[PDB]
Ligand binder design. Structure first.
Ligand SMILES: CC(C)=CCC/C(C)=C/CC/C(C)=C(\F)COP(=O)(O)OP(=O)(O)O
Ligand SMILES: [Mg+2]
Ligand SMILES: [Mg+2]
Length: 493
């Protein structure tokens, strides 16, 4: 076969082999500077776990010298190891997202709590947030408490503020698998005498979470998202492997009561991104065997839909997002009775395409992610007449954006002038596979050649990460590189 089909075959063998007997693809998260700095400040303040704090310190120094992250995470590390204002500006430099205002408050309060700058001079209600992802309520309350105590106004804190932090005192792994949220809550809780009896036991577990490199990961892992994406890729191969069945079973038995899926085992918060991948996978690999879970996932998505036709990530009434809306459109299009909601979602996508053919950055920091999501919805949903033309013109502009920004090596990076990486290129490939058939030396041809070239001798891919959280801060789940390249090659072959 062609070099691309051979590449696809070697990668599929590797992804199949990585799926365990429990049907899950392990997907641990790498250490991150931000959480390792917060863990270091917490353990230092409590004079606890000397061995762990020594390793955290060495991890932070090594990482700053060899692989420094964005300016905000660097300023955080420097504050705990020891300009805050300019680092925050460069970190949120052109962060064009509906959460920018909240991120400015969050990030500045983090830095102030670590003694690098003053606390924001804002009304205490600024830390109020409507219910969204479960752990966000806890994070904002933690920051409010830290600011209240940090500025000398502890009496400001109300019992409803403390109550939101109680999950951080539970034994074992972090609530919702989110180490950042627990660390912020514990930094706040250590200021409360009536909560300190529970603090000692949890610092022991926090300290035990360190990874081999001495750091602390953002989250425990992303095995639900990764397993679902990998099953989708494998189910798109000409002859899908047998393992797709235990993978579908592993996902289905983890569904939440609302019918959706969280990003890892034990995450009770469902989200649209995870659910759409599981739904797409189950629809292809086990539509009868898991008919009930499929129906429950569709119901989950429809219950989240916003009145504007778009879909949020976590909760109805939070701002719709383009990538989530395109994903839900594609996932819901397999039933002809949801046509009205699918059409309204695709129209939302078209309405929000930018004048240069792009869409948005949100949970991915490359522009190609939202392009690939949008192009699949624009070209995957059936449509005719006026609506077909409108969607085809929008898809054409998106694919033209890809062609206009393709790097010389055939790949794409996080931004137009960034070096290529396999994940960003994988997303572009999925979109381009909906354009005209590949030709010698054309954009899709060259992107496939790039991916062929970047394959490791062990058949895998090592990529710069693209996932962000809290946005726009990158975190690294290495298992995703192989999975998304395979999804790209399955789409394109
Ligand atoms: C699965 C995908 C790709 C999309 C949905 C987001 C998920 C479930 C990602 C897993 C990691 C995680 C806890 C976050 F990114 C949420 O960040 P955080 O709550 O800090 O985000 P902000 O709302 O503050 O930006
Ligand atoms: Mg957050
Ligand atoms: Mg978080």
């Amino acid at each position: 076969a062609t070099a691309v089909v051979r590449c696809r075959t070697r990668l599929a063998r590797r992804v199949v082999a990585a799926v365990g007997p429990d049907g899950l693809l392990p997907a641990p998260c790498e250490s991150r500077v931000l959480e390792s700095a917060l863990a270091l400040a917490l353990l230092t303040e409590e004079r606890a776990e000397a061995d762990a704090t020594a390793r955290l310190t060495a991890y932070l120094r090594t990482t700053l010298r060899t692989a420094p992250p964005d300016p905000f995470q660097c300023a955080v590390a420097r504050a705990v190891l020891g300009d805050a204002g300019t680092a925050l500006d460069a970190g949120l430099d052109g962060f064009d997202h509906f959460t920018a205002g909240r991120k400015r408050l969050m990030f500045r309060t983090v830095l102030a709590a670590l003694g690098a700058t003053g606390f924001p001079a804002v009304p205490w209600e600024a830390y109020d947030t409507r219910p969204q992802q479960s752990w966000l309520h806890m994070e904002m309350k933690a920051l409010k408490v830290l600011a209240a105590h940090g500025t000398g106004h502890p009496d400001v804190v109300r019992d409803e503020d403390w109550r939101a932090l109680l999950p951080a005192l539970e034994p074992g792994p972090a609530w919702e698998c989110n180490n950042l949220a627990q660390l912020l809550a514990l930094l706040a809780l250590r200021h409360s005498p009536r909560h300190r009896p529970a603090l000692g036991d949890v610092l022991k577990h926090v300290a035990g979470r360190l990874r081999p490199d001495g750091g602390m990961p953002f989250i425990d892992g992303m095995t639900v998202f990764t397993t679902a994406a990998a099953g989708l890729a494998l189910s798109l191969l000409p002859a899908p492997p047998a393992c797709v069945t235990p993978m579908a079973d592993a996902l289905a038995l983890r569904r939440n009561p609302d019918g959706g899926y969280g990003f890892h085992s034990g995450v009770a918060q469902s989200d649209v991104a995870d659910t759409c991948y599981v739904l797409e996978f189950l629809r292809r690999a086990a539509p009868d065997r898991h008919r009930t879970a499929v129906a429950e996932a569709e119901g989950y998505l429809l219950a989240l839909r916003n009145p504007d036709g778009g879909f949020p990530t976590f909760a109805r009434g939070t701002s719709s997002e383009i990538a989530m809306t395109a994903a839900a459109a594609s996932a819901l299009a397999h039933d002809p009775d949801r046509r009205e909601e699918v059409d309204e979602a695709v129209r939302y996508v078209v309405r929000h395409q930018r004048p240069d053919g792009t869409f948005e950055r949100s949970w991915s920091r490359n522009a190609t992610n939202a392009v690939f999501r949008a192009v699949l919805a624009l070209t995957g949903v059936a449509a005719h007449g006026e609506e077909r033309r409108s969607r085809a013109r929008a898809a054409e502009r998106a694919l033209a954006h890809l062609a206009a920004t393709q790097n010389g090596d055939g790949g794409w990076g996080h931004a137009e002038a960034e070096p290529s990486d396999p994940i960003s290129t994988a997303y572009a490939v999925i979109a381009l596979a909906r354009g005209p058939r590949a030709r010698p030396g054309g954009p899709l041809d060259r992107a496939l050649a790039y991916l062929v070239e970047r394959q490791h001798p062990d058949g895998g891919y090592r990529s710069r990460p693209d996932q962000a959280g809290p946005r726009p801060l990158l975190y690294d789940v290495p298992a995703l590189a192989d999975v998304f390249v395979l999804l790209a090659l399955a789409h394109a072959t």
